[model samples]
Target chain A: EVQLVESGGGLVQPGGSLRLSCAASGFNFSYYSIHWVRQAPGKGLEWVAYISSSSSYTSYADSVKGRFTISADTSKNTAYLQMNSLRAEDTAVYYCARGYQYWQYHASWYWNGGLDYWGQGTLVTVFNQIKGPSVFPLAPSSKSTSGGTAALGCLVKDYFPEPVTVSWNSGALTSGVHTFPAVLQSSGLYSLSSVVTVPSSSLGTQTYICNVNHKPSNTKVDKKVEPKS
Target chain B: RQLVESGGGLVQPGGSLRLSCAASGSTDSIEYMTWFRQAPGKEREGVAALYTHTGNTYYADSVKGRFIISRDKAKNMVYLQMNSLEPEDTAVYYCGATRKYVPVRFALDQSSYDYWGKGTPVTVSS
Candidate 1:
């Protein structure tokens, strides 16, 4: 039951600030480190900072350099990420994940750690008027499932600004789902679609959901699944 | 170069599969690798990590008894293996590691400095 809940965002002028949190439970926070991460819309991942509750030590990514601060309150088993001097492009979803490290002689060992647990992600917005893309599961319309493989696409579109991130899954088919890089639409907004190959099992859900996050300023979050529910 | 790639799978329950192999110092020496899994409709979880360098690995108490992270030192490769699998065991797995000097804490990740693949999914249909 290791849980991480992050809350931050709303409206932030060009130079405003915000603080996000990841409250950890189920595992002792004493030996673990919490890492902050962000992704620009339609971009890849970025490691922001790290905070060790036990060691009271911290590290920051070069990109955020002096613009961000990371801290933890071991007593409460929580980690925090605070940012300042925001810019329009400074918007993105912020996440808190448990980071770990182990030492051996000189053979040296390290890892960003397994991103085993994560937050739903807090959205931070620094925009003139922020609007993220709409996400929904595409209907089969005309596809065959008899082969144990079907083309299932999760489409996201109509977002303001460029760049966005997306992920799709159905318990039956997790690894095989493939998403082509998001395309910059004619409207200037970006759109990306992920197609999942349903596993050859009749025991899983018929529909898969796609989570769409507006990067940079992750002020918007949306997901769409079939059955209209 | 293929810094990391899973052996591949479509394994059934009671069966086993070598999740993947990430780079060590060489195909002869050793390093570290933690296997993390992303479950359907669920978040990712670190099942286990093998640290050949330290001769100690980390595992979740709930999963420790079932999953094994093996270091084929001679092979200079890392793997996550499950002797007996269950439906809940089905999901896509990935290998993560960090290089020298960097504190291993989630280092395989994009460092505050610098991290998928199409992914190889496993199914356990009874």
Candidate 2:
């Protein structure tokens, strides 16, 4: 039932400053803490900072001790990350997540916990080094149990800066279109999927075309599937 | 010390899956082991974690009852067991660890990931 929406991600010059925001909902903001995690291109996840509103405590990783600052406004149910003196290494996808209390302990016990909810990370491009996505073929997929709709899927992978636009040329598809948020692969690259469904009968006489656009790199590609008949 | 991930293969939608990570060097200084899915960015998620000393485990709400976090201290190994897997459970899973430095100045803030595994992909399909 929890949700985190992030904003304020884009190109920033070196030695500049950037501020990212996360709006949280569906829970009491003051009761939980929010943590910031980032992933550099082609790298693993890194925890940069965290802030607890109830405890009035804030913590930062050694790597971002002085460069990253995390703060929360309980009244607004929002958390923010401020980065100063950004560098090429600062370019990454930044995510904010809610942290729950695993257990209560004294000063001696060790508490190992993880974030429960996460936001769809925002891409922070410190420079113009954008790696556009590679569009996979628009493969035909199985029919739904309802027996009236046919589904086709398109995969976009190996992208940087995490924003891509997808569209179809088979008229205005208002419904039955599913697009998932970008998923970071083990290689530190990102991938996304979009599935479009139309009337089963339409597939036999209609050709469907899928278009993918990576704006940062100014790349556009399309894949078309022929009608079965 | 490097971390090597293991486990994860094709599993039926209703079946179970187990993922593990082993530390190449000593895990003595490591305080906890964390499990993350999708590894990074976009929609990366924290699955669960197991504390080394107390052997206590914590889980994310998304996988609470069906997820089990455990560790073998002597072997420097940690594990995540997920039951009643669904199609949504399919993703790349990574094992991570947080180290405890000497003097423990920032002891309360011990949840950061210090080392991460390369990651293991899991597919839960019909």
Candidate 3:
């Protein structure tokens, strides 16, 4: 099984730098090239860098020409990206793909290129200041459903670095909570939604609370909701 | 700019499948067009691509001999064809177009697809 295992993620201070790696295995590293791609939160993919199999040919996006360096070690079967002076906008999920192309020589050398194998992806977040999340009022799907159950949804928005957890105050309640993946908003922040369901009969009599923990800011916020009779 | 892709509905295990992506609201020519697919619970993978500037078409090794990627430049359309398909070929297919290009001696290198079409679900099961 040809594999491209990628590593290098987590928070980095603005102006800091980091090295990302994609270690290749199960195939001859010198037989194929490696390409780096990235996707900002809620955005399309962008090709950032490329290195030929032999490490002789290297290319970088004009956007990151000075800030990014792409190289490879055929003997180690690995590709690397050295990032410098990161900024908040640099936060994104970076991926390394195996460039599958045939080498043909006709006077000058050139070959058609395409990507085949891909790494899972590593998310790098560059933050200058930490921001806590804001919780929205809990919205109940309805007072009760036919089965006497109610679904409550809470939206947690405007956070940095993607570290946030949601919990419920209703004790011993398991299996009815669905927390979606965080989304990157147009404002360059992150948002997420979590829903919990409980017996409708217990709505007005019971106060359900949503607890949001923002790890970067070390802040915990709890929002209480009571169904109106 | 938008890409409206169509033609992938369902294909039998041994049948042929063809999908098309028509570009709209973009004046740029179809220089770099690529196809991508994502299987259920899997990472997105590149399938095929047609680079018109160099008149070259590339396919993944898995689909190399059985797949064809071509373009109708005048109509700003790109198509993907798969022959003798299997149930494992089921996936959501997306068509993308790139606007940036760089010449690497005889071959051309592209940055990335700046625009992509809404993926078309492909089912290979009978």
Candidate 4:
């Protein structure tokens, strides 16, 4: 199983620079490059750049020039993206992704523009909260086991655009499969849920995946779990 | 002022030479100007070598003979013309100075670009 772990929450002043990191544990970091993406509050996602672990080559998005820098330590299996001369507009959730280079495997290389794995997002806030930690309820558990059937669900609030694709995969499954679109709500942001049930026995490994792909952002947010009773 | 020109405007392989460069304020001793290409919706790609003030040239590790830069200091214009223009060669072309001191190596080159002209967009058409 491949996993990307990001740092904890951060609180910084309006003008202070913030540095965030993504650490890889089980995989070979050198083979996979790191990419940084920014998600504005209740808005779309932006592609920042990619940092190569082996050569230190950085390919930055044209719009983000001069304001952001991407660096990495291949030895430690960690990559970093820093935002300098920060402003309130820079406040958002940042995510790091493991980028794959298709050329290495094929004679003619082309950037597929798809992230195979991603880190849990790190929330960077400009406002200071004196209160205790903010908490989110544990996601509803999945009922599945190794080689068994299982179902996963999410109760999303508010009405989201339809025709969303849910993908499932694991290290055993080199590529993921997308499911048909399922819609739950129509009006104001209300509770909506989508579930994916798969036969575990046909799969060789224990890891099961569930992800939601949204429009505009064109991003896939995912969660992995072991089968439960 | 240094004026370096790139050779061969609509160069098709084994085509004629068309070069151009910009001459800055009042100078006759132009050694050479560098050439660069910005790919469609992507970062700048370094093409061909540096031409010296003495008419000597240096070719990039990848591109040779196919691309050349010539200049006219009297007119203050540098031209970049390439022969046998491939679809991959269609991009924004630029020519600038080769200074001694480089501040930082961020993108491709070792030095930070202090001054640059808006790139000349070159599209390969039928």
Ranking by lDDT: 3, 2, 1, 4
Query: What is the number of backbone collisions in each predicted candidate, taken in the order shown?
Result: 25, 0, 0, 39
lDDT of 2 by residue, A177-204 (tens): 7888888788877799888878777766
Give me candidate 2's TM-score against the actual structure.
Answer: 0.41
Model 3 chain A lDDT-worst window of ten: A102-111
Q: What is the TM-score of chain A alone in each candidate?
A: 0.55, 0.58, 0.73, 0.51
Give the Å shift of residue A61 in candidate 2.
1.1
Candidate 2 local lDDT, B18-116, one digit each (tens): 788888777677887788875212245678877777776777778989989887536587888889998787666777777753233322222477766
Error in Å for residue A194 of model 4? 9.0
- For residues A98-207, could you state the per-residue lDDT of candidate 3 as single tens digits? 86322221111111225778899998878876799999866675536846778886799898867788888844455699888998799888899988878777765777
Predicted structure with the largest DockQ when compared to the true one: 4
When just chain B is superposed on the true chain B, each candidate scores a TM-score of: 0.71, 0.84, 0.84, 0.63
> On residues B16-119, what C-alpha lDDT tens digit does candidate 1 reach at each position?
77666656345433345566665533555667766656657778655666777876635556667676777786666656654443455543332311122323
Ranking of models by TM-score: 3, 2, 1, 4
RMSD in angstroms between candidate 1 and the native structure over all alpha carbons: 18.3
Candidate 2 Cα deviation (angstroms), residue A9: 1.9
Q: TM-scores, in order shown?
A: 0.40, 0.41, 0.52, 0.38
Task: Give lDDT: candidate 1, residue A123.
Answer: 71
- Where is model 3 chain B poorest over a 10-residue stretch in terms of lDDT? B102-111
- Candidate 4 docking quality: incorrect, acceptable, medium or high: incorrect
Tens-digit lDDT track of model 3 for B49-119 = 77777758777778888888886646577888889898878776778776666342212122366766656
